[PDB]
Symmetry: C5
Subunit: 205 residues, 5 copies
């Protein structure tokens, strides 16, 4: 089994429009933002222009294949796989994906998609130029799937919150924390899980 045979199968059998749900069991999607840069801040308008890696992970067993005597991983175009319909609730602009829209698929059906995104948000900027700085919270979760179909969860809290952050940034990061939530909206019957990421940063002293 070669990469050609592997990609060819996934391409020929995959269905991007169908969520890899197993029974009433929701699809476990883990989200993790890794800030790469903070470009524009406006404390007057409370708007931020930031860059980050939307490190996403989930499992699709219909993509699994035996790799004992074959490659364990392959790069698959996002368009040939089903992908979480995630959305940043307080995004003020659409995502400007800066990187190739390819995902990584492991023979066991594990999918890893980590695109670099530049996007504007509406959040609390007050305190940016302070020692305690500002705390901009960004909430992102499925747009059409509720908790019974899709569930989002945070990840790796170890990793230095700014090991990927640009050093030439006009700003600096104090701390980053992610706490998942589960909300029921008057608009909508069922509950919608989402990961809230709090970006505590400040202008470089």
């Amino acid at each position: 089994f070669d990469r050609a045979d592997i990609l060819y199968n996934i391409r020929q059998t995959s269905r991007p429009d169908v969520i890899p749900t197993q029974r009433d069991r929701p699809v476990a999607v883990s989200v993790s933002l890794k800030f790469i840069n903070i470009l524009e801040v406006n404390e007057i308008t409370n708007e931020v222009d930031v860059v980050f890696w939307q490190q996403t992970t989930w499992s699709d067993r219909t993509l699994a294949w035996n790799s004992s005597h074959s490659p364990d991983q392959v790069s698959v175009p996002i368009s040939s796989l089903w992908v979480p319909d995630l959305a940043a609730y307080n995004a003020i602009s659409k995502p400007e994906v800066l990187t190739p829209q390819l995902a990584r698929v492991v023979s066991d059906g594990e999918v890893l998609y980590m695109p670099s995104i530049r996007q504007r948000f509406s959040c609390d900027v007050s305190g940016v130029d302070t020692e305690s700085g500002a705390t901009c919270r960004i909430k992102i979760g499925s747009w059409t799937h509720h908790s019974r179909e899709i569930s989002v969860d945070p990840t790796t809290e170890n990793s230095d919150d700014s090991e990927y952050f640009s050093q030439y940034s006009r700003f600096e990061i104090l701390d980053v924390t992610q706490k998942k939530n589960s909300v029921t909206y008057s608009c909508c019957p069922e509950a919608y899980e989402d990961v809230e990421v709090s970006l505590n940063f400040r202008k470089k002293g």
Copy 2:
């Protein structure tokens, strides 16, 4: 009918170019804007840059299926369904859809599409920085279908007009009301229904 079978049928049988009309009966489309944010205001030019959820709903019985022994709802791509050719009459820019273009389809043929849109409009801004504030009216309705084919109607007046509004917005909402209309234009023979939404807001005093 697993989710794959459901989506597969809709995809294979649907016709996005055909309005789900039953007899001389128009398609009942309900529109409801939920303001999420007001980004830029210019009282001199009377131009607004706002974000909102264009909560739309209508019914397409050709999408209905028996859900007695399967899911009741599925997420369908907008491109696989017929969608109302709505247009904001005083929109100054085209809609910047910020969210995944997926709709939600209920087994009974009910369709719910609620994209988050950022868009500019030409309306009355005078009074923005006033206690009574300004009242910006936005009218949206079908562009090519008259009242006999498509009819638009407002919805849920209860819901707090700003329960989804951003708190970090430079502005605040006093009140929001929607009143449907029915106009005949010299340009055009038949009548064209539309929902007029009045946004009474003001700068934070």
Copy 3:
């Protein structure tokens, strides 16, 4: 015959790349701009940012269908029909079509396409802030078809020149007139008809 059957036929038999010409007879296309708004003016640079309805009409008999028992009209996507390759000669930016790109087709082969366009032009702005105001002329005609294939003609001079104009516009319209032309260019052998629309407006006083 119901809309599905109608749209289905047009879709299956139409050819967007073929001009509906009958013999050496040109296709009679009528153009009519209805100004909706004037957004930015610069008398120094003679540039205008305006919004208007490019009300276009022509006839394609290959789309005609018997309707003694069926609607005589349907909404057809622009991509499934042949459309006039019109261009605004003094357009400084490309057309930002603000509305659904659907056309209206009458059972007799009559086609009506009226998109709302925002676009910048290079024209005479001098006099904008004057009682007599400025006169910005915009010329639009087929880009590749000469008078023997396509002929453009103005229309309805009655209709109040500003019955669709925005009232919140920083400017106001004095008068609008359209006079068709027929030019032969040294560059090009045959003659190219075009409609010249003169927009006499001024800053509201």
Copy 4:
């Protein structure tokens, strides 16, 4: 052989990805810019924002057909024909094609494509506000095909250099000249022909 039949053949037999080369003989492509307007100039940054007609012409005999009793020319979409991969070497932005992307095809296989393009360039602006003015040179030629496959050549020097120029332009044209070249680059083995157009203009006085 009406037009539908003509377009239908070209569409069904054409191959946009294949250069109409005859033997080791290159394809003779003639390029000719006709300036329509000069919109923004910055002598400090040496950047120009200009509009022009990229009048292009070449020959593709596989498109030829018997015009004995059938139309001689037809309008063909650019996407159904092979087109020169021209590029403006000092273009600072990509081409904003302002007109329908249709080409004109003559029964003998002659192809004429003249789109109106707005684009920014990096060139010599110094002297713009002078009697002798500035001379902005723009070089454009095939990006991937060398002299043995594609050869570019200038054209009609008669035509008044500003018979299509906008009169409301903040600037004026003194003279326009085009001189073809043939360069071999260290980067690249073979030689690459290109047409250099010198735009001598100045701010009006």
Copy 5:
């Protein structure tokens, strides 16, 4: 076989989604940036707006043919070939490809793709207006493929670092050097090679 037969084969047999890997052997991709221009600099924000040729080269033997009596090179659209999923790690905007997205393929399976790109970056701008100037480093490597699949390497150090640079640029180039790297990220298990290009330039005097 003619140009047509060659392109036709590549088109009919190629697979853009499959990396041309031979055994556990990685694909050797060589990257080389040739700066064409530096458009905007901001020492305060450490952001650069630059234009360059992302001269890329690699080998895909499945594209090789017998040119022993046929043309040896052809221009192939990027969409019909597999292409390295390269990404500029500190790119602040996505690539604005200014040129035709065509690659050059040699009968031996060698592929050469050199698009002209305008793009913004986050790097060290301090010193721009200095004799020693600033050194802006840009790192680019595969986004999804590690060193075992894709390996990147610099190239030709001879070529005058500014023989393609614009002379009208507000800035000038002192020196350009490229040194490949190999990094293992806590985020990611395997190692990811990348080419680091250091642009030492300064404002003119």
